[PDB]
Amino acid sequence: MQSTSNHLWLLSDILGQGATANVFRGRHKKTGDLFAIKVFNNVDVQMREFEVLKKLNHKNIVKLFAIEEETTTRHKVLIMEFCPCGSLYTVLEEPSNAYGLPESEFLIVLRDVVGGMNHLRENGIVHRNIKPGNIMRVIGEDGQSVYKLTDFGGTEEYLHPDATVDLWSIGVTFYHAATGSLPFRPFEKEVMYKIITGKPSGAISGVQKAENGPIDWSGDMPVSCSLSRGLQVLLTPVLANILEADQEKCWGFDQFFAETSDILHRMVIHVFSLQQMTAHKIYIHSYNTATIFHELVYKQTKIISSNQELIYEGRRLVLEPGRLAQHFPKTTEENPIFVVSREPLNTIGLIYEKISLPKVHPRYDLDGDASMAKAITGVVCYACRIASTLLLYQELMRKGIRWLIELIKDDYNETVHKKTEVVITLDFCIRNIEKTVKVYEKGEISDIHTKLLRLSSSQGTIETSLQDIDSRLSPGGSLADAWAHQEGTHPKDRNVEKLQVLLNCMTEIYYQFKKDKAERRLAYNEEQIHKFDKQKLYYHATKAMTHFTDECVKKYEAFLNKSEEWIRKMLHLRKQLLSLTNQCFDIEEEVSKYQEYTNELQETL
Amino acid sequence: MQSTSNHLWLLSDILGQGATANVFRGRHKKTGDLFAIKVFNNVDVQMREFEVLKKLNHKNIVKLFAIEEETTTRHKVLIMEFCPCGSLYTVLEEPSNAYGLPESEFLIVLRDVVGGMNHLRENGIVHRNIKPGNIMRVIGEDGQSVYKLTDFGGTEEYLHPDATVDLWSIGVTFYHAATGSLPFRPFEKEVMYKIITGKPSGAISGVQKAENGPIDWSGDMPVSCSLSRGLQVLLTPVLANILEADQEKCWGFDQFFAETSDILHRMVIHVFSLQQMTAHKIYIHSYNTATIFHELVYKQTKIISSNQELIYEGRRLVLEPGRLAQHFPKTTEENPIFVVSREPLNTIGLIYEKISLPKVHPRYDLDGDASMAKAITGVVCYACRIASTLLLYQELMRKGIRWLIELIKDDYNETVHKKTEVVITLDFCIRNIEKTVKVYEKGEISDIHTKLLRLSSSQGTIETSLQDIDSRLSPGGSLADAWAHQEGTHPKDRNVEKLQVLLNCMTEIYYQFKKDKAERRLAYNEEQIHKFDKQKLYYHATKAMTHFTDECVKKYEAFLNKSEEWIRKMLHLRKQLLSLTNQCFDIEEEVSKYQEYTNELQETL
């Protein structure tokens, strides 16, 4: 081991090698607290650099405690705080993050990197171009991660291909965090320049799949990007304006900080469009009215603001247009605000990428096995995530259907008793005026009596139409939701846990291969166990991807195909009921005036 | 290492020592699959025993594959399937299970142990008295645990204190799984007999806290038992009738199997009593009607069947009494069926045990440190579980209040428009009969007119009472739920995750102490790091138990104290509205007959 005047560390504790220094895990000699010790191996310029960096204090900067001296040799050490969870490389090498971070973790990364950038620029420290190795991770005091910046002042794909802050590396870091792959990929330091130089405007990625072929340019996030559409619309102009090929037209830092702070100060409202079967995340400020909420729902569900009918926990929801967005009800992903229209739409469903398993290569290649295990485990993790999303859509669909039938029945009942009131008034006016004429006679009498007989015949038509509508809405009729508990997948079938067991077995084999890759060669029995695990991994992958596409996707497509025709039948019934309600209001508008003239003729004679 | 003709194992793989055999983890020589090998160290009686046990096949029996012979020495081995997750001792030594298993895991243990007992008895295998070391655990193909029985055919507390199956050890196993402690505990093999011999009827535990003092006998599960009340009522007679002190009066196996199968075939319905703020789990068969459901709600919430008003997702719930219990709606713990009455009750809340931290002992005792770490981590785990339960009660309380106000407003609105209808009819009858009398005169007339003037005055009182009720139900009035978003704890405060971080640090120190207990003595620096961890554990425990009782319990008691007076105000308003509705029905019942007599007097003159 080695030591300083106040710290000591064992040399079998190497947190990091490097051509400049070595980072060990050591501990304070009198209190036992852990630290990371950076030992150099080789002057007051760098001492004044570390003295300026010592005075910083922020929750996104790794603290430098003290700079001391080795006791055996006269080297320099830096004592800094110990971040146990590794850097952002270790976050992005997990197989669940092989197709991009989840959206909450992505927003945490975005917030903390931009906050560290701002606090370094505001004091005046000229730093490097930060990459995913300069971003450490720590577990905060409330479970959430906290990302910190360190070492400011393949590691070569993140640079621009040539005092002012350059923002290419931050853009490639955020595209890599959002999707899991680098934006500009040649096939298999001049090809990079030839790709990025001939890049069009607005393009944020370019893929080359052949040798020296043309480059497929793209302007959207890929289909296997886990970020919601409401965030991709806010995030794609930022990455389109900082990954610009010409440095004159980029943003610089103040416009970038203002636009990312406009992204970060939004709240989220979860809205599940029922006729399209699609969930949405509307990002809105805390001080916007309901008018901007209706415009944001229009931009994603294509429903005009005068047709959006909102449902929240049973009853309807009537947002008056002066209601601020911080006084909306609290929504989660499993408790959304359902949007139903009256005019027809297209039932889309969930749009996901079709990912297949790669071909396993049969040779005993001890470096290729770790890459094969990582790629196959990433495919099965993507399938598990899509399986849970499909189950969530089916459950919200069943709940929204069950609420919408009750709202239809309430409109039915108020129409029924309003009609019964108009019926009582009509029959009284008939009986009154006819008794008065038949007694008084020992003009406009036929003009009254013919029209009121017409109204009673119209009433007779309205009543049998209401009987037919009750015959359809009855439990056991044509618009009952007894089919919805008999298709799709239910949470008692436990499909996601069955994928998760196979996924845990595959992740264990992946960790064993990655551990066996660091040791250069193995013994006899260890090599045989390695080969048996190599084929058993692919057996688990075949089993899980058969279960996914023959238990989860097929039943979902059956459920979607029935939901389409249920929505068509619902829209037909809900239009006919509105026609009957308007006809009853027309009869009431006539009956009022005729009743007035009847009562006047009663009083004058 | 050692070997057989088809299996091999390294000797640094000892799954278990014993005075009879040694259990190693080995693997099949041609396919690489893992097995557990039991090597004896010492005849056809036991060979025929193992041949009879070889033919069994059940999902609660550990499979015996083959019996073979060591190649070096001529010993015997048993190859059986490898259960990686350990026995039930390893399940009950976890600090989260220090006060009993969760209820779902307890029902899994109960089902699988009784199923293994039945399948062994039905074939005719005479086995031992099974204890928690004879119950292995495996992870099934869908995430749930599967408990299996092995080795049939402090380990001495589970025996009776003296062909027919004895059931004392099963009873002590289930009491230990439910509560985490043995039922009969002397203080610090004759005292056990003197306690259990003088045991009264029905008692399932007896605690002695002094030297040779009297024994506190109990007939209930303790207050820190995590099992719900609806299960304790079903489970306490079983344990009271198999822990009987006299072997003549015990059940035997058929009555025990029938009663535990009556427990195991129940479904669960989650019901949250709102006026008492208590959640309940009603256990009901799949073929019972709604009448038995109302009787089971009466037995726990003390609400008579003619007063239970049920609320489920917004609207009410009217269970017709011929509706089977498998056609009820599906409920979870976060989606219950709310029960509200009209007559007052007592707001109880959650009843939990007050557990404090034990005194840390300052001496360097390397066996006492593991016990101290286990006991302190068990206390903080119990506190984390109670914190999550308190947060669940506050969230369900906020949701039930928000729904109940809407139901009150719906009763208000139907009363209002029914009254407006009766007002129109009354004013027409007044105007008609008075115009007819004033014109006809160029009897009972004052008897009509005085009474109808009384009815209009009564109407005038009804209208201002309805205006006062709308003034109270208005947003911003006296019966608004604006207080409920300003007290208690919210899920955005993240108190449970703040306890969970401290709990993870404490569990890591506990595992390090348990690892250091197996090594008999330590070096210098290792002993110093041990002492610093010993005091840092108690620092984390003090921090977590201060945060619990000053952030979680105090805000909960404020929320409970406001909910009591809100429930009192709600019951007062909801009674006055019913009085107004009945008065309007009385006025309508009078107005109908008076209108008939008015119309007859219109027609006759």
């Binding site: 006899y524 045989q528 080969k531 | 290492m1 070997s3 091999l8 020589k29 690489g32």
Partner: peptide, 9 residues
């Protein structure tokens, strides 16, 4: 390439 059975030697 293919796995061959284990041995104790």
């Amino acid at each position: 390439d293919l796995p061959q059975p284990l041995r104790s030697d």
